[PDB]
Write a protein that binds this ligand. Structure first.
Ligand code: CLA
Ligand code: CLA
Ligand code: CLA
Ligand code: CLA
Ligand code: CLA
Ligand SMILES: CC(C)=CCC/C(C)=C/CC/C(C)=C/CC/C(C)=C/CC/C(C)=C/CC/C(C)=C/CC/C(C)=C/CC/C(C)=C/CC/C(C)=C/CC1=CC(=O)C(C)=C(C)C1=O
Ligand SMILES: CCCCCCCCCCCCCCCCCC(=O)OC[C@H](CO[C@@H]1O[C@H](CO)[C@H](O)[C@H](O)[C@H]1O)OC(=O)CCCCCCCCCCCCCCCCC
Ligand SMILES: CCCCCCCCCCCCCCCC(=O)OC[C@H](COP(=O)(O)OC[C@@H](O)CO)OC(=O)CCCCCCCCCCCCCCC
Ligand SMILES: CC1=C(/C=C/C(C)=C/C=C/C(C)=C/C=C/C=C(C)/C=C/C=C(C)/C=C/C2=C(C)CCCC2(C)C)C(C)(C)CCC1
Ligand SMILES: CC1=C(/C=C/C(C)=C\C=C/C(C)=C/C=C/C=C(C)/C=C/C=C(C)/C=C/C2=C(C)CCCC2(C)C)C(C)(C)CCC1
Ligand SMILES: CC1=C(/C=C/C(C)=C\C=C\C(C)=C\C=C\C=C(C)\C=C\C=C(C)\C=C\C2=C(C)CCCC2(C)C)C(C)(C)CCC1
Ligand code: NA
Lengths: 32, 484, 30, 27, 37, 348, 31, 36, 187, 32, 30, 76, 32
């Protein structure tokens, strides 16, 4: 009946680090 | 630039930014403390303080709250079940909001010390550079820690001003928070004697204040100053990491083995007292004592309380749960609602049999029922084809002597096999699995989860201490040699 | 959604390794 | 009362108890 | 069994398999003797 | 010490004698590493040839009984001993050595002396790195094997019932330990162990790849057909063509290394991280906190008699381990199991 | 001599030779 | 110095070591641990 | 303990693979590789021994008090087999299934006679010999070889019973079982 | 036994044969 | 009173003391 | 310097070793053959694995009386 | 007890637009 706890855990552990590293990469590429 | 894993190295030569991040870290820790206490209060059910104990609900931070005095909240209930008194400001939720307020103020002070970081207090009066007299800072903090030990031991735990501590029975039946008389002898170094804790904190406080006075009065020696690099802040970072992971190892060991600072009524029972037959020991001793005083064996078991019979249950064993068996212990195999009693098994001709209790390691165990001498007399077989000890042909009958079933004698082999498989796990108990939609498999105690987290953090800070000691002894090569 | 989330994770790994092979930074300094 | 009986009562159940481990050389 | 005229010679027969293993080891002996030049 | 007078004491004479170039260096850690390590290897070697294990495990694990190098082992004390340090002078042996043996005391002797020898060996690496004035990345790497030693030989028996459940110092006893975690713990299914396996396999992969690539891109540097005679430490130029190596692996694999520092730091990082993850997993199993089962699969198997997978098969083989192996591996627990209740299927 | 190298190589040599002589005796022992 | 060749020293040491392992392997089939 | 020289170049004292045992008015030669296990299965046993590999292969003697003269007065060997059919296990599973094959309807295990005898000794005592093949629908160890030696001298019946699987039968253990049979005797 | 004695004398004759050749060539010149 | 285990610990402390003295003499020699 | 390439090649190293190494070898031989290893390290003889009172593998199952327990459970 | 769906909804509706506004603020103040 859908394990929403594991779903939101997986979703957050994907979303937060990939977004954080994308911010750092964008500021590295913009500010040489 | 600066790599992603070194962004906190900019605050090394900044006491103001260092104290700002220390303040914000304390703010975050206090905020978690308040939030977790309120979450546990929201998910807590204090209705049954016997057969639905707090450690069965996954209570992690509430036992640490209750270990030093608070027992009742704003809900009008007390975890011991005793009639609600007046907490004052210091209740579960009141203390929780106090941590939340403390977190907010530490946050605001952290922001302030971030904005104002160039204090001349962090300035060397004679050379004008940024420096800190770390031995003097240590002496001041040692004085503060000694005064805190002396206060916490001579006013709170001894109860001359504080409420005391949680002390209970040797077998976890009756216990409460009250003052304790300090034990100043060799018994004070007994791990389980609660009086050893106020005596320890008082003597530790007097030694700490004396050592703080010594470090205020006396500067270090130059050879030691150069050998350990006392002028460096990563050196004392490595030393502090060393001390904190030693303390982590000590607390994990004491929590896993039980101690005076580790109540069974607060953190659940222990795998060692499950193995060594401690609750089962007094269950059988009490039953034999009641039956040896001219009393028939049908009400002797009724004299056994619900707490002890539940303590003799391998599902309450901390060394049984799983790493990803997430949640409360009640969420694994339901909530206990009643004690069925001792399943006593009889042979057809007449001789008492006992189930071999399931060990700590096993997920599942073969059901065998052996006699007093120690030979196998019955079992739940696997083959069922060339079996000779099987219950259907040997005629094992269960009698039962407890609460809901006191005289229900079963000779049906299916029910006898079921009750044998239930009694191999300790005392049989009714569980409801529809209240929380439980799993079926056993879970781990907050004692077990605490020990796992602290042992893991102990290993990571062992590596961290080794690495930071590497950095501070080898500060020259880690900074540069310049062709030398 | 039981198998679909593992599908997302596996496709993410494949896309990341594909981009690391082709849309990589050029190898500088020798 | 009977320490002999309780030892034989629970050692069928589990053979690793403190009391059976203690003074086993007499057994 | 070995034939009748050769029966007491089974001891000098019995060691003969290991001689090729002694050969490569003899090559190593000669290389040590020439000091692996 | 900052152009001070630095009056010489006994410490400076001792330091001057310890920090000397010899055949084998001593240093300060020689006060600890040399005796602790020599006692550890001597205790293991003596227990593997003479010290029997008949009393504690009910078996033979020494050469004096009929055991080989792959059979003898310095065995752990009995489970009823719990977690005693088991001194020769303690309440156990009461000062008697010939019965301090055959009671598991030599196992504790070897384990404690080995732990302190590992401590002294990291101190060795640290102070020699100081003498050569180089970074102690070797000590950084060595922090992981001792984490494994502590988590395996100390933390796991400390969290479980006693030293009996620790690995005995040997070969076949280690294999028993391995199968013990297989059946009783399902250690393969633990994600931390999967990380440890990945770390070791990747480290061996890096070892082979780096060696082959350097040895196949090593330039000419002379006229002889033997490449090894073409190496000279006097020249400062690099031995192998890193740009050629990078092009080769970029066109074969798709990704390739560009920095020697990042290459060698990766070779440093992969086994250390894998071994620390395995150490954390064994810390988890020290508390019997297993990754043993999958809830969805066990429920689906219980409510579906025709749904089976390799995980269900693995659970069954674990039950085979427990039922047919605990009966003899745990003599203190007294498993007198009839062999018609053990799980045993068709014919076999 | 009795130097550091002498002490180390003798601490490795003497008990190992004793143990080898022991085990060569151990090989001819029968039940 | 140089009175006996180093190669001959290594060779006789190797002969003794190989014979040592040989009698060790021989003693596995007889005596203790012979499984007979 | 006391000091004594280790047996170097001093012959071996035991190679037959058997050890003597003298019990209550009976003697036998137990297999050397076997150990006793305290697991009473019919409550009438005084002696039980099992191999160290897997104890499907067992030997045990029955001390049952039965009183009617001699084994000839006990009757035919097949009648004796009919009396102790409970000794060859029991299928307590009473479910319905015609699906095993090689066995009768709603049955799991079966027993077959392979040979009976009335072997005597030097003193003139009579001994009943029994060879039974006990197969089961799982094909467990290819069946089991139940070798039974029976006699009665005093008012207590003596019934040796050597059990062994068929998987071990043709691997070199049938000689051991026959050795146990013709070494077991009652005096 | 005689069989074992002859086996050992054959073994030592064939094992010492090689090093005897090497020492003979070492003490009788060279060309190796 | 002084139990035998404590007495053995005190002799163990003396033994460790003389072992440290012995290793100190050994390293100050040679 | 003595780089071990000169110690081995000199017979002075071998004259002080042609009897000491075989001396240690025969010392170990007599040490094992006289039963002294069994006496010093507690290993039972091949004829003293089981006593007459017990015929199963020994178990300690005790801590503070384990010395006297192994004394009674070992070979006299 | 505890409405985990509402808790998650409220938590993300806080954090994601807050992080969005803050990231544009700090990136605007980084390069005025
Ligand atoms: C070391 C500190 C610590 C300890 C000992 C505990 C212990 C406990 N907590 Mg708790 N918790 C903590 C910190 C801690 N917590 C923190 C910091 C938070 C805030 C985030 C929480 C929030 C929290 C909640 C909301 C709940 C608990 C609950 C519980 C109890 C149930 C067991 C459990 O945790 O589930 C299982 C334990 C684990 C799965 C351990 C994880 C082991 C590693 C870290 C997993 C590996 C992760 C991997 C590397 C990342 C990939 C993930 C990705 C794929 C999604 C237990 C006694 C439950 C409870 O009782 O309610 C009151 C509950 O619901 N905790
Ligand atoms: C006004 C200050 C104050 C007060 C009165 C409290 C009070 C309390 N806190 Mg709290 N805390 C505070 C500040 C405060 N805190 C701050 C600033 C933080 C942020 C860092 C925290 C973070 C925090 C957490 C995370 C938790 C608490 C918890 C608790 C409760 C139980 C504590 C306990 O039993 O664990 C025992 C405490 C200890 C064992 C500390 C021992 C100190 C070690 C041993 C010192 C070792 C080194 C030392 C320097 C050596 C001294 C040398 C010597 C010779 C003198 C308790 C009511 C717990 C709780 O139940 O939540 C509410 C809990 O989980 N607090
Ligand atoms: C005279 C009054 C008095 C009294 C009655 C006590 C009483 C007690 N003290 Mg105490 N003490 C006192 C004065 C006193 N002390 C004074 C004046 C000081 C100086 C400040 C101390 C300093 C002190 C320390 C440092 C400790 C105690 C501890 C204890 C408790 C020991 C029992 C226990 O909890 O389990 C047993 C406790 C232990 C086994 C901890 C020992 C630490 C070992 C070495 C841990 C090993 C970890 C190490 C890294 C090895 C590696 C492990 C590897 C497997 C990874 C006990 C109740 C211990 C404690 O805090 O209890 C939790 C402890 O650590 N005391
Ligand atoms: C209180 C202890 C402590 C403190 C003050 C420090 C402080 C520092 N460390 Mg260190 N370290 C510690 C413990 C500590 N460490 C431990 C236990 C380990 C072993 C795991 C290490 C291993 C370590 C390494 C390998 C390195 C440092 C480095 C550094 C420096 C910069 C790192 C940084 O924060 O940038 C940013 C850090 C991050 C962005 C962390 C990434 C996010 C991680 C993966 C998860 C976040 C954790 C989670 C949110 C909270 C969990 C913590 C809680 C459960 C305890 C910094 C001054 C670096 C350095 O000095 O470079 C030369 C560096 O290379 N540390
Ligand atoms: C110097 C290197 C060294 C080190 C680091 C160790 C370390 C260790 N040994 Mg070991 N040992 C050594 C050398 C060493 N040993 C040698 C050379 C021998 C041969 C004799 C032994 C024989 C030995 C045995 C037989 C055993 C150990 C054991 C142990 C372990 C526990 C020791 C213990 O608890 O007792 C306590 C030790 C100490 C308290 C150290 C003493 C230091 C004191 C405090 C100095 C006091 C001196 C003082 C200045 C006196 C003057 C004061 C006066 C004038 C007033 C431990 C890890 C035990 C073991 O392994 O457990 C199974 C054990 O059974 N050792
Ligand atoms: C339906 C589908 C998709 C099926 C698949 C489903 C399924 C099977 C799932 C897969 C799950 C999965 C991802 C498995 C991995 C899980 C696992 C256990 C991971 C653990 C993760 C982890 C954090 C472990 C900790 C240890 C750790 C950090 C390991 C990392 C290992 C690692 C990356 C090693 C390197 C591997 C590698 C290929 C080597 C690089 C070699 C290299 C390119 C050198 C080339 C080179 C060499 C030279 O010498 C020179 C000179 C130059 C110049 C040069 O270039
Ligand atoms: C973001 C990424 C999150 C990853 C973590 C997800 C945990 C899985 C989960 O959903 O659990 C979910 C479970 C809760 O689980 C739920 O609990 C409920 C009662 O509150 C009910 O019982 C539910 O039935 C149950 O599902 O636990 C957690 O909330 C997570 C706690 C995390 C901390 C646990 C202690 C371990 C601490 C340290 C260990 C690490 C040490 C260093 C590393 C090694
Ligand atoms: C036809 C070819 C067939 C191969 C196609 C598939 C191969 C996949 C490519 C390998 C992975 C790329 C690694 C990205 C990471 C990456 O490219 O980083 C980029 C990095 C380049 O680093 P540099 O040399 O530039 O380092 C110096 C820097 O500091 C300066 O830029 O490459 C490497 O790290 C070395 C390659 C190791 C490769 C390790 C293998 C990782 C395993 C991947 C497993 C996938 C999951 C399993 C599936 C579910
Ligand atoms: C300002 C102010 C205030 C206050 C505010 C607040 C309220 C704040 C807060 C805050 C908070 C309330 C916080 C909290 C938090 C939490 C945290 C911080 C956490 C956490 C976690 C972690 C860290 C994790 C980890 C991990 C992971 C990662 C996974 C799982 C497992 C582990 C554990 C490992 C007021 C108005 C009142 C008044 C005054 C002023
Ligand atoms: C225990 C103990 C102790 C200690 C002792 C010690 C520390 C010593 C030692 C010792 C040792 C130290 C021994 C040894 C041994 C060894 C051996 C036995 C070896 C070998 C063998 C072999 C067979 C080999 C082979 C080979 C190889 C494979 C490699 C190379 C080549 C060759 C050929 C050599 C004491 C008394 C104090 C007291 C307490 C207890
Ligand atoms: C048929 C026959 C025969 C033949 C024979 C032949 C064919 C020949 C030969 C031969 C040979 C063939 C001999 C030999 C010997 C040798 C040896 C036995 C060896 C050795 C080696 C070693 C000792 C080595 C050492 C080393 C080195 C120096 C280098 C590196 C390291 C090593 C350690 C490896 C005759 C005439 C007797 C007659 C009878 C029969
Ligand atoms: Na099968």
């Amino acid at each position: 009946e859908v394990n929403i706890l594991g779903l939101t855990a997986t979703a957050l552990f994907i979303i937060i680090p990939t977004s954080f590293l994308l911010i750092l990469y964008v500021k590295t590429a913009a500010s040489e | 630039g600066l790599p992603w894993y070194r962004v906190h190295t900019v605050v090394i030569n900044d006491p103001g930014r260092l104290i700002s991040v220390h303040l914000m870290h304390t703010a975050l820790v206090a905020g978690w403390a308040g939030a977790m206490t309120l979450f546990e209060i929201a998910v807590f059910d204090p209705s049954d303080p016997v057969l639905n104990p707090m450690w069965r609900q996954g209570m992690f931070v509430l036992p640490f709250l209750t270990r030093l005095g608070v027992t009742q909240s704003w809900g009008g209930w007390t975890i011991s079940g005793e009639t609600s008194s007046n907490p004052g400001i210091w209740s579960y939720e009141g203390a929780a909001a106090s941590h939340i307020v403390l977190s907010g103020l530490l946050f605001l002070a952290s922001v302030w010390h971030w904005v104002y970081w160039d204090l001349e207090l962090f300035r060397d009066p004679r050379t004008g550079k940024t420096a800190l007299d770390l031995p003097k800072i240590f002496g001041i903090h040692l004085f503060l820690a000694g005064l805190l030990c002396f206060g916490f031991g001579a006013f709170h735990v001894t109860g001359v001003f504080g409420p005391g501590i949680w002390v209970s029975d040797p077998y976890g039946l009756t216990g409460s928070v009250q003052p304790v008389a300090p034990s100043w002898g060799a018994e004070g170094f007994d791990p389980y004697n609660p009086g050893g804790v106020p005596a320890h904190h008082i003597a530790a406080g007097i030694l700490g204040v004396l050592a703080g006075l010594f470090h205020l009065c006396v500067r270090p020696s130059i050879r030691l100053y150069f050998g350990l690099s006392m002028g460096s802040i990563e050196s004392v970072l490595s030393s502090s990491i060393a001390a904190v992971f030693w303390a982590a190892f000590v607390v994990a060991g004491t929590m896993w083995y039980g101690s005076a600072a580790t109540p069974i009524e607060l953190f659940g029972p222990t795998r060692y007292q499950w193995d060594q037959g401690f609750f089962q020991q007094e269950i059988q001793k009490r039953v034999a004592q009641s039956t040896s005083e001219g009393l028939s064996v049908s009400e002797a078991w009724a004299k056994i309380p619900e707490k002890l019979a539940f303590y003799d249950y391998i599902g309450n064993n901390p060394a049984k749960g799983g790493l990803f068996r997430t949640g409360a212990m009640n969420s694994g195999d339901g909530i206990a609602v009643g004690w069925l009693g001792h399943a006593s098994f009889k042979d057809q001709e007449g001789r008492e049999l006992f189930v071999r209790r399931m060990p700590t390691f096993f997920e599942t165990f073969p059901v065998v029922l052996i006699d007093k001498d120690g030979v196998v007399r019955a079992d739940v077989p696997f083959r069922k084809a060339e079996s000779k000890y099987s219950i259907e042909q040997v005629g094992v009958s269960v009698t039962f002597y407890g609460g809901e079933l006191n005289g229900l004698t079963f000779t049906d082999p299916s029910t006898v096999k079921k009750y044998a498989r239930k009694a191999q796990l300790g005392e049989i108990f009714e569980f409801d699995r529809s209240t929380l939609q439980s799993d079926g498999v056993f879970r781990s105690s907050p004692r077990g989860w605490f020990t796992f987290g602290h042992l893991s953090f102990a290993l990571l800070f062992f590596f961290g201490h080794i690495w930071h000691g590497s950095r501070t002894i080898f500060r020259d090569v880690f900074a540069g040699i310049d062709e030398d | 959604m039981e198998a679909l989330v593992y599908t997302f994770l596996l496709i993410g790994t494949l896309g990341i390794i594909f981009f690391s092979i082709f849309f990589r930074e050029p190898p500088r300094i020798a | 009362q009977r320490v002999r009986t309780v030892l034989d009562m629970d050692d069928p159940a589990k053979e690793e108890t403190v009391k059976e481990l203690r003074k086993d050389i007499n057994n | 069994k070995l034939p009748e005229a050769y029966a007491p010679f089974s001891p000098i027969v019995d060691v003969l398999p290991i001689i090729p293993v002694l050969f490569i080891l003899l090559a190593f002996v000669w290389q040590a003797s020439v000091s692996f030049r | 010490i900052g152009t001070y007078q630095e009056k010489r004491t006994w410490f400076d004479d001792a330091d001057d004698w310890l920090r000397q170039d010899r055949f084998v260096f001593v240093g300060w850690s020689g006060l600890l590493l040399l005796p602790c390590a020599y006692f550890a290897v001597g205790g293991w070697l003596t227990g593997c040839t003479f010290v029997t294990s008949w009393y504690t495990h009910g078996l033979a694990s020494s050469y004096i009984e009929g055991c080989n190098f792959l059979t003898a082992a310095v065995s752990t004390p009995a489970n009823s001993l719990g977690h005693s340090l088991l001194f020769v002078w303690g309440p156990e042996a009461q000062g008697d050595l010939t019965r301090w043996f055959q009671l598991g005391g030599l196992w504790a002797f070897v384990a404690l002396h080995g732990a302190f020898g590992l401590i002294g060996f990291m101190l060795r690496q640290f102070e020699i790195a100081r003498s050569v004035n180089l970074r102690p990345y070797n000590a950084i790497a060595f922090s992981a094997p001792i984490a494994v030693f502590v988590s395996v030989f100390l933390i796991y028996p400390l969290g479980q019932s006693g030293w009996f459940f620790a690995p005995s110092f040997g070969v076949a006893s280690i294999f028993r330990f391995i199968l013990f975690f297989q059946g009783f713990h399902n250690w393969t299914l633990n994600p931390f162990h999967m990380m440890g396996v990945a770390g070791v396999l990747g480290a061996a992969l890096l070892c082979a790849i780096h060696g082959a690539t350097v040895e196949n891109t090593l330039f000419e540097d002379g006229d002889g057909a033997n490449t090894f005679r073409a190496f000279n430490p006097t020249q400062a130029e690099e031995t192998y063509s890193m740009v050629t190596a990078n092009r080769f692996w970029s066109q074969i694999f798709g990704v390739a290394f560009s920095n020697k520092r990042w290459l060698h730091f990766f070779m440093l990082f992969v086994p250390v991280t894998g071994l620390w993850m395995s150490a954390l997993g064994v810390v988890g199993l020290a508390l019997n906190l297993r990754a043993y089962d999958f809830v969805s699969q066990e429920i689906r198997a219980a409510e579906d008699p025709e749904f089976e997978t390799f995980y269900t098969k693995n659970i069954l083989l674990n039950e085979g381990i427990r039922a047919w192996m605990a009966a003899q591996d745990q003599p203190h627990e007294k498993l007198t199991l009839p062999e018609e209740v053990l799980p045993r299927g068709n014919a076999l | 001599i009795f130097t550091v190298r002498w002490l180390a190589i003798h601490a490795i040599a003497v008990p190992t030779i004793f143990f080898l002589g022991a085990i060569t005796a151990m090989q001819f022992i029968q039940r | 110095i140089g009175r006996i060749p180093l190669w001959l020293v290594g060779t006789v040491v190797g002969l003794l070591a190989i014979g040592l392992l040989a009698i060790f392997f021989y003693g596995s089939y007889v005596g203790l641990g012979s499984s007979l | 303990a006391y000091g004594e020289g280790a047996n170097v170049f001093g012959r071996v004292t035991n190679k037959s693979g058997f050890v003597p045992y003298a019990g209550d008015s009976f003697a036998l030669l137990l297999p050397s590789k076997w150990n006793p296990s305290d697991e009473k299965e019919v409550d009438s046993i005084v002696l039980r021994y099992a191999d160290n590999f897997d104890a499907v292969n067992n030997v045990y003697v029955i001390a049952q008090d039965t009183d009617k003269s001699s084994i000839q007065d006990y009757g035919s060997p097949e009648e004796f087999i009919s009396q102790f059919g409970y000794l060859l296990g029991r299928q307590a599973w009473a479910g319905q299934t015609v699906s095993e094959g090689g066995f009768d309807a709603n049955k799991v295990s079966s027993a077959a006679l392979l040979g009976v005898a009335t072997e005597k000794d030097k003193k003139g005592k009579t001994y009943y010999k029994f060879e039974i093949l006990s197969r089961t629908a799982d094909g467990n160890e290819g069946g089991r070889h139940q070798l039974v030696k029976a006699t009665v001298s005093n008012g207590k019946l003596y019934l040796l019973k050597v059990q062994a699987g068929d998987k071990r039968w043709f691997k070199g253990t049938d000689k051991e079982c026959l050795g146990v049979l013709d070494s077991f005797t009652v005096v | 036994s005689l069989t074992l004695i002859l086996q050992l004398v054959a073994l030592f004759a064939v094992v010492a044969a090689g090093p005897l050749v090497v020492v003979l060539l070492s003490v009788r010149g060279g060309n190796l | 009173s002084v139990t035998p285990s404590l007495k053995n610990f005190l002799l163990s402390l003396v033994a460790g003391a003389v072992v440290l003295a012995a290793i100190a003499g050994a390293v100050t020699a040679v | 310097e003595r780089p071990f390439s000169d110690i081995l090649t000199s017979i002075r190293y071998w004259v002080i070793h042609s009897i000491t190494v075989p001396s240690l070898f025969i010392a170990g031989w007599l040490f094992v053959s006289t039963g002294l290893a069994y006496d010093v390290f507690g290993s039972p003889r091949p004829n003293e694995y089981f006593t007459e009172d017990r015929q199963d593998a020994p178990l300690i199952t005790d801590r503070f009386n384990a010395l006297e327990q192994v004394k009674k459970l070992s070979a006299q």
